[PDB]
Design a binder for this molecule. Sequence first.
Ligand SMILES: CO[C@H]1O[C@H](CO[C@@H]2O[C@H](CO)[C@@H](O)[C@H](O)[C@H]2NC(C)=O)[C@@H](O)[C@H](O)[C@@H]1O
Ligand SMILES: O=c1ccn([C@@H]2O[C@H](COP(=O)(O)OP(=O)(O)O)[C@@H](O)[C@H]2O)c(=O)[nH]1
Ligand SMILES: [Mn+2]
Length: 273
Amino acid sequence: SLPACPEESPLLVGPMLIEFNMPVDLELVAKQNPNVKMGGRYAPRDCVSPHKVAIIIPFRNRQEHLKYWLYYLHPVLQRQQLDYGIYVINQAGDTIFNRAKLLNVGFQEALKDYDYTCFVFSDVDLIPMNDHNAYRCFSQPRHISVAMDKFGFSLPYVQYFGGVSALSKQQFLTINGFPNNYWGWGGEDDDIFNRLVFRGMSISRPNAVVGTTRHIRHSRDKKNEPNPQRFDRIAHTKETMLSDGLNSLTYQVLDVQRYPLYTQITVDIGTPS
Ligand SMILES: CO[C@H]1O[C@H](CO[C@@H]2O[C@H](CO)[C@@H](O)[C@H](O)[C@H]2NC(C)=O)[C@@H](O)[C@H](O)[C@@H]1O
Ligand SMILES: O=c1ccn([C@@H]2O[C@H](COP(=O)(O)OP(=O)(O)O)[C@@H](O)[C@H]2O)c(=O)[nH]1
Ligand SMILES: [Mn+2]
C-alpha cells in the first residue's frame, strides 16, 4: 500500500557544483547518507520506485576516483527516488584490463541479489552535473554521459555510447549483453552501439545541458593499452554478437565484500583466449 513515486522526482535541484580537489572520507560519506543500507542499497521510504536499478562500475586500482563517485552519486540517486544498488566489479590480477567483460559479470552477479530490471553502466571517473540526468532505464537504451567536459560539453560523435549508459534487463538480454573479447582500451562501447542498432533500437539521450558531466582528469592506467584489433572487431559485431557475450561468458568470483556504500565483487576474468 505505499503509492508509486511520482513519475519525475520533485526532489531534484538541477545543476550542481562538482569538484575533485578535496579529500573524501567514506566513513563521513556514510554518515552523510544514513538511509543507504549495507552494500550500498536504497529504496525510498515513502513511495515505490518502478526503477529497480543496479549500478555497475568496472574497476581496478581507482580507489580515489571511486570515493569521489560515491560522494557525488549517492545523494543524486536518492533524490531520483530509485530503488538502487551499487556494484564495483573489481578485476583480480594484473593482466590486461577488460571493461565490457566486467560489465557482463556485474549484470549477471547483481541479478543474484535482487530482481533488478534496469542496469546503469558507469565508468568510475564520471560525475553528472545535473540531477535531472536520470540514472535509470527508458523504452530505448539510454546514453547518459552525453556532454562531458573532456569532449567540450558535447558528444565526440553522434554514435558515441561510452561513459555512462543504461539498458533495461530486456534491452541487455536482446543484444546478448556485451562483448567479452575487447581487451585493453577502446571500441567495446562502439561494439555495444552496433549491437543495439542491429537489434532494432536507437539511443535515447537527455539534452546537452542536463547531460553535462565531469570526468576526473587522470593519467594512463598501465595494463589497458589501446587494443590494436578494435577497428576490425567493431566492423564485425553483427556476426560476432550472436555467439560472443552473455551466452559465452565465464568467470570466477574470488571475493564479495559488502561495504556500507557499495558491494565490491572481485573477479577473475582470465586473459585472452
Ligand atoms: C568509432 O570511432 C569513432 O571514434 C574514434 C575515437 O575512438 C573512440 O573514442 C571514444 C572516446 O574516447 C572511445 O569511447 C571509443 O572506444 C573509441 N572507439 C574506438 C574504436 O577507438 C575516432 O577516431 C573515429 O574517427 C570515430 O569518430
Ligand atoms: O586500470 C583501469 C582501467 C580502467 N578502469 C575503469 O574503466 C573505465 C574506462 O577507462 P579510462 O578511464 O581509461 O577511459 P579514458 O578516460 O582514458 O578515456 C574507467 O573509468 C574505470 O571505471 C579501471 O578501473 N582501471
Ligand atoms: Mn577516464
